[PDB]
């Protein structure tokens, strides 16, 4: 009735997507074979949001998995929870992109998109009332950022009056493992700023930082990093699937956050995260969620909001709970932190409450934060791209595939206009009106 079609691009997208379907099948009570083994009756009331009915009482996900290397597709097939996916939806090539954005966007990925859009159209038209799409990919690769941005451009032209989420893994300076990351990054940010409704910046430094000093975790494997990524992406759309006292889906969240269509780069965060040696020393109460949600430790990007200004924020709560404390605690942090919150817009906090908690927890919360402090990542990508493009380094790997040198120049101008656009809104006088 309100269907979200899932899109996975690249090796990083498939590792995230495999854990995401594992975390919400447990939430809805689905065995790896495909049937339903649960204890409540409201788990099947709204299950067509992500699942599609099959014969014999079997549920298959509404996901398509796309890659340019067949090695990942067999791994995500033969994984712990890879049996539930329909084998038609596994679309793949034979030659990899090669950590090259030009191969994925112009030459190699230009032939794979004919097969992908036929499957996407086939799966989206079957919905009675399509709600929107959702994509998980990484900007540091070739088959996720080269061809994932092409999937962005075709879908937005075909389905204009639809809402599209993306979960972009923004590249990181300190734990970078690929030399040509700023080449792949700045050629894709222009595609995400023009043809995407919501963008969430998920960074591997913050996933490592949460797993080190908050969880006190010994070995933070990629499964543990994707465990945090699947947390916010399960919790952001929990008002769609479960009833609550104050319901707000992702479209109502989109209206209350985005003041201008060029400002849609957000920051996620999951509130109730404790370590094994400190959980039984802590009480689970609404002020304890609000304190752990708003500090800069739990932000899932390399952005410190102290340098910037919080533009507009969310809190999506989960659990049976009395929302005086929800209506009081974010007012208290509104009145205290006067400088961090921009005074040009009053009472910018958006509130939603869902009745059904996650499995095994009685209370939980999720954060979405639009801040001007996101512009320091684009400036860091700009300076690393400027310092290397000026010497024409690694350029023959890109200019030999047909794209000329002016695409880089306009990619610089589009990002420099973006970082300046955030800068005017950060330093703007509210109590004045202009020439208009």
């Amino acid at each position: 009735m309100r269907e979200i079609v899932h899109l996975q691009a690249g090796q990083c997208g498939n590792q995230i997507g495999a854990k995401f379907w594992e975390v919400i099948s447990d939430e809805h009570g689905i065995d790896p074979t495909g049937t339903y083994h649960g204890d409540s009756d409201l788990q099947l009331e709204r299950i067509n949001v992500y699942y599609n009915e099959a014969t014999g009482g079997k549920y298959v996900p509404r996901a398509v998995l796309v890659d340019l290397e067949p090695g990942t597709m067999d791994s995500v097939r033969s994984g712990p929870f890879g049996q539930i996916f329909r084998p038609d939806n596994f679309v793949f090539g034979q030659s990899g992109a090669g950590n090259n954005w030009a191969k994925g966007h112009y030459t190699e990925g230009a032939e794979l998109v004919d097969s992908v859009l036929d499957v996407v159209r086939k799966e989206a038209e079957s919905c009675d009332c399509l709600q929107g799409f959702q994509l998980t990919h990484s900007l540091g690769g070739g088959t996720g950022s080269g061809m994932g941005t092409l999937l962005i451009s075709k879908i937005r032209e075909e389905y204009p009056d639809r809402i599209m989420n993306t979960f972009s893994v923004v590249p990181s300076p300190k734990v970078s493992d690929t030399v040509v990351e700023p080449y792949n990054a700045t050629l894709s940010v222009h595609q995400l700023v023009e043809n995407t409704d919501e963008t969430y910046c998920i960074d591997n430094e913050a996933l490592y930082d949460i797993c080190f000093r908050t969880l006190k975790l010994t070995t933070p494997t990629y499964g543990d990093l994707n465990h945090l990524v699947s947390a916010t992406m399960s919790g952001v759309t929990t008002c769609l699937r479960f009833p609550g006292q104050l319901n707000a889906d992702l479209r109502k969240l989109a209206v209350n956050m985005v003041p201008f269509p060029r400002l849609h780069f957000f920051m996620p965060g999951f509130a109730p995260l404790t370590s094994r040696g400190s959980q039984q020393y802590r009480a689970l109460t609404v002020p304890e969620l609000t304190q752990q949600m708003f500090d800069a430790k739990n932000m899932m990007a390399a952005c410190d909001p102290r340098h910037g200004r919080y533009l507009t924020v969310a809190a999506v709560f989960r659990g049976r709970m009395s929302m005086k404390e929800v209506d009081e605690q974010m007012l208290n942090v509104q009145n205290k932190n006067s400088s961090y919150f921009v005074e040009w817009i009053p009472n910018n906090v958006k509130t939603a409450v869902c009745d059904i908690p996650p499995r095994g927890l009685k209370m939980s919360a999720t954060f979405i934060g639009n801040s001007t402090a996101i512009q320091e990542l684009f400036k860091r990508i700009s300076e690393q791209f400027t310092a290397m493009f000026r010497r024409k380094a690694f350029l023959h790997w890109y200019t030999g595939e047909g794209m000329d040198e002016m695409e880089f120049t306009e990619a610089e101008s589009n990002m420099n206009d973006l970082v300046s656009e955030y800068q005017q809104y950060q330093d703007a006088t509210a109590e004045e009106e202009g020439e208009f």
Partner: peptide
């Protein structure tokens, strides 16, 4: 076994089959 196309494949065993 899952990654090879339907042509150019020997008869193998697919996973979960």
């Amino acid at each position: 076994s899952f990654s090879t196309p339907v042509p150019l494949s020997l008869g193998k065993l697919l996973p979960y089959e």
